[PDB]
Write a protein that binds this ligand. Structure first.
Ligand code: A1AIZ
Ligand code: A1AIZ
Lengths: 250, 233
């Protein structure tokens, strides 16, 4: 079809209710882990299970991202770089959302619930597990709602890579301005949700701030996770997919 | 009880502005090991003043010395970087490490792996410029970084509760500044969101910087004084 100019992005013409509806409708399928439960539970086998789930979720992630209002207005290059930036943060926020109602455990999939002591089966994992558990506990304590969750997940996609567009082209400035406007609309939607829930104005701003501050922790977890995943690739417990990496690099 | 929680928004702004550290001039030929020596010497001197600034951030003194040290251990580089970004706002394409140390983006190429970090710092300064970030907001953001960046890695519930209450007061303060500047309610929450979203990028830059420094064989000389100032010695 026709690629609209940024001022004619569908994102900017959505009401708050329509933005929520769009984000809920984009939400990817629940996946079940496919595994043999009789296999001995080792570092290699655990990381293999998690890799297989990650690979399947990433397929659905791409289709989800394309359905996030504002995303497809970006160049294909900028789209890919948002995803390359955010993919682990997006996996992690999903995981902590899914795990909210299971204190002490991470619900990687409905049929794959792991506790922090299984995290110790993978060297370097338990520290990240504990951070994920703490984030899930914080979401539980804040009573994070599904409509808020989908807004936060879309914010991670749009925000985690915008600052590593380098402003070396005029197009980059247009892309940055567009992302800003979409992020403003998602903020309006988050406030709309909180106002409808009955929060006072002060409470609305405090809650928004607390939710956005958690995003900085999610970023931190992603960075530590990438460092951990690199170590796992050296041990040949996680694939390197180096040809995809050199693809993305060139 | 905590003085921080009894303060009004106007009083909080005053306290945060009053806590601001001095501007240091570089004191420390010109290879990569010398570039890292220059930047490390500057960081070492700034850290002495940072610890005194941290102790003056309302709410910080209420924590145990071990928690104060934990938060600083988590946030120190974020704080150095946000200061750098602020200082560089009026110097597009350059990083004002000090008034007598203005470095071009391409001077990052002198240290392997540094120019990518320079680029992220420059992008942050550009963002602050486009938003016309104000000093009053800057000090709120820096305080948020100190309190937020290690809170998730921590009676311990009483301390986390205290920190979240202080953070809520800073949010109120940022909103108050924006309201007094004439922003509509919609503009206020949008700007709050844009400011807090930049802190995700500052965290990223810190993480990347820590990895880079670990690569570059890089405790600052003044470490013992830092702990002494924190009463952690
Ligand atoms: O797809 C690629 N590789 C294969 C699939 C990913 C392989 O890595 C993973 C990733 C996660 C994983 O485990 C999970 C978490 C986790 C977090 C922190 C840790 O320290 C360890 C684990 S959290 C979590 C949440 C879930 O829902 C599911 C799983 C997990 C296990 C392995 C590349 C992507 C990037 C792309 C690029 F670069 F082009 F963009 C190139 C290709
Ligand atoms: O000693 C400690 N760590 C090891 C110290 C090693 C020295 O570190 C640096 C840090 C920065 C640096 O260069 C600067 C920037 C930069 C950022 C990213 C890069 O990749 C490269 C450069 S940005 C920037 C901005 C500036 O204003 C000035 C300099 C710089 C050069 C060296 C802790 C201290 C605190 C203590 C605590 F917390 F308890 F108190 C815990 C222990």
């Amino acid at each position: 079809a026709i690629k609209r100019s940024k001022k004619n992005s569908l994102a900017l013409s959505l009401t708050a209710d329509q933005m929520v509806s769009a984000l809920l409708d984009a939400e990817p399928p629940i996946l079940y882990s496919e595994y043999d439960p009789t296999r001995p539970f080792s570092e290699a086998s655990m990381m293999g299970l998690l890799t297989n789930l990650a690979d399947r979720e990433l397929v659905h992630m791409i289709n989800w991202a394309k359905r996030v209002p504002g995303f497809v207005d970006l160049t294909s290059h900028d789209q890919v770089h948002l995803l390359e930036c955010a993919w682990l943060e997006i996996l992690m926020i999903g995981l902590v959302w899914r795990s909210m109602e299971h204190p002490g455990k991470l619900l990687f999939a409905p049929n794959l619930l792991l506790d922090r002591n299984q995290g110790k089966c993978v060297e370097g994992m338990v520290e990240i597990f504990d951070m994920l558990l703490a984030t899930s506990s914080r979401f539980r304590m804040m009573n994070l709602q599904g409509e808020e969750f989908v807004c936060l997940k879309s914010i991670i996609l749009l925000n985690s890579g915008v600052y590593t567009f380098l402003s070396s082209t005029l197009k980059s400035l247009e892309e940055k301005d567009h992302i800003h406007r979409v992020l403003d609309k998602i903020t309006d939607t988050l406030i709309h949700l909180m106002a409808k829930a009955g929060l006072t104005l002060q409470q609305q701003h405090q809650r928004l701030a607390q939710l956005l501050l958690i995003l900085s922790h999610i970023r931190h977890m992603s960075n530590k996770g990438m460092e951990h995943l690199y170590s796992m690739k050296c041990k040949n417990v996680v694939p390197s997919y180096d040809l995809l990496l050199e693809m993305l690099d060139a």
